[PDB]
Amino acid sequence: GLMQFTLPVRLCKEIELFHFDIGPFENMWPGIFVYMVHRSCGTSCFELEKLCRFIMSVKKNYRRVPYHNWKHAVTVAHCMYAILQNNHTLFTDLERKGLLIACLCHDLDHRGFSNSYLQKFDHPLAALYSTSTMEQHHFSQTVSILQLEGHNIFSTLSSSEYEQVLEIIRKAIIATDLALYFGNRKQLEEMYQTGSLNLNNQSHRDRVIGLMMTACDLCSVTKLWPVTKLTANDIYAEFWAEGDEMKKLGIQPIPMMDRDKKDEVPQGQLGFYNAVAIPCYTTLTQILPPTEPLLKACRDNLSQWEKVIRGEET
Numbered sequence: 118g119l120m121q122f123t124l125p126v127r128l129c130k131e132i133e134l135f136h137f138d139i140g141p142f143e144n145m146w147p148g149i150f151v152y153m154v155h156r157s158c159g160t161s162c163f164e165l166e167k168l169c170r171f172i173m174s175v176k177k178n179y180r181r182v183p184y185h186n187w188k189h190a191v192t193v194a195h196c197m198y199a200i201l202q203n204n205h206t207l208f209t210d211l212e213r214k215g216l217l218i219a220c221l222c223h224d225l226d227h228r229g230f231s232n233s234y235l236q237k238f239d240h241p242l243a244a245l246y247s248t249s250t251m252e253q254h255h256f257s258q259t260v261s262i263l264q265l266e267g268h269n270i271f272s273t274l275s276s277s278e279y280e281q282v283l284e285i286i287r288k289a290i291i292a293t294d295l296a297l298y299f300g301n302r303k304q305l306e307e308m309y310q311t312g313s314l315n316l317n318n319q320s321h322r323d324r325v326i327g328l329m330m331t332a333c334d335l336c337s338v339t340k341l342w343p344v345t346k347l348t349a350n351d352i353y354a355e356f357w358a359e360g361d362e363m364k365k366l367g368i369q370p371i372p373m374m375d376r377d378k379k380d381e382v383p384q385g386q387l388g389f390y391n392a393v394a395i396p397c398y399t400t401l402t403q404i405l406p407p408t409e410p411l412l413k414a415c416r417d418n419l420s421q422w423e424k425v426i427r428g429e430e431t
C-alpha cells in the first residue's frame with residue numbers, strides 16, 4: 118500500500134522523455150511498466166499482485182521473433198505514457214487505465230507475419246477474422262489473459278466501467294492495423310482544419326486514441342539514431358523471412374519483404390517516413406501540441422536516412 122516503485126536516477130529522469138529506450142535488461146521491463154502505471158494512473162488503479170501476474174502472463178504470450186516481441190510491447194506502452202503525462206488533463210481515469218494495458222497487449226501472440234501472409238497461407242486465423250486478422254487475435258488474447266484466475270486487474274471496476282475499458286482497449290488494438298491508419302488520419306486532418314473536431318464526441322475521441330496508437334506503435338522512428346537504425350534491422354529481419362515464405366508459396370513478395378532488395382532500404386525508409394510517419398506525427402502534434410518532440414525526432418531520423426543515401430551515413 119505504502120510501496121512506491123522507483124528507478125535509478127538516469128531512468129527516473131529519462132523515462133519522462135519521448136525518446137527513452139527501455140534498454141537491453143529484460144528483467145527491468147516489468148518494473149518500468151509498473152512504474153509508468155503508478156505515475157500515470159495512480160498506485161490504486163490496480164491491485165499490485167494481479168497487475169504483476171497479468172504482466173507476466175502477457176510477457177509469456179509474446180514470442181521470441183526479431184521485432185514483434187515483449188520489448189516492442191513495453192516500448193509502445195512507454196510512448197503512450199509520455200503522451201498521457203504531457204496531456205494529463207485531456208483523458209479520463211478509464212482511458213489512462215485502458216490505453217497503457219492496450220499498448221502492452223496490442224501485439225499479443227504475434228508470429229512475425231503480416232495479415233497478408235496469414236491470408237495467402239490460409240491460416241485458420243484468416244477464416245476466423247477476415248480483416249485486421251492479427252489485431253482481432255491480439256484483443257482476443259488480451260480477454261483470455263484477463264479471464265485467467267487472479268488476472269482480472271479490472272475486477273474493482275463497475276459492470277459498465279469494465280465494458281467501457283474493454284471497448285477502449287478493443288478499438289485501441291484494432292487501430293494498430295496500419296491499413297486503417299490512412300483513412301483515420303485523413304478524417305482527423307479534415308475535422309481539425311474545418312474546426313468540426315470535438316473531444317466530447319465519443320467517435321472523435323475514438324479516432325484521436327486511434328492516432329495516438331499508430332504514433333506509439335511507430336515510435337521506433339522517434340528514437341536516437343542508433344536505436345532507430347538497429348530496430349530497422351529487426352523490422353526487416355521479419356519482413357524478409359515473410360518474403361522468403363511468400364516465395365515458398367510460389368509468390369513474388371512486395372519489394373519491402375524481398376531480401377534481394379537490401380540495397381534500397383534507405384529509399385524504402387524515406388517512402389515510409391514521408392507516406393506514414395511524418396503525416397502521423399504532424400496530425401498528432403496539431404491535435405495535441407505537447408507531442409511535438411515525436412514530430413521533431415521523426416524529422417531528425419528522416420535526415421539521418423537522407424544522409425545514408427548521400428554517402429555521409431550520419
Ligand SMILES: Cc1nc(C)n2nc(CCc3nc(N4CCCC4)nn3C)nc2c1C
Pocket residue numbers: 295334335336337338349352372373374378379381382384385386388389
Ligand atoms: C516503425 C516502422 N514500422 C513499419 C511498419 N515499417 N515499415 C518499414 C518498411 C518501409 C519500406 N521499406 C521498403 N523497401 C523497399 C525496398 C527495400 C526496402 N519499402 N518500404 C515502404 N519500416 C518501418 C518502420 C521503421
Ligand SMILES: [Mg+2]
Pocket residue numbers: 223224251293
Ligand atoms: Mg501489430
Ligand SMILES: [Zn+2]
Pocket residue numbers: 189193223224293334
Ligand atoms: Zn505493434
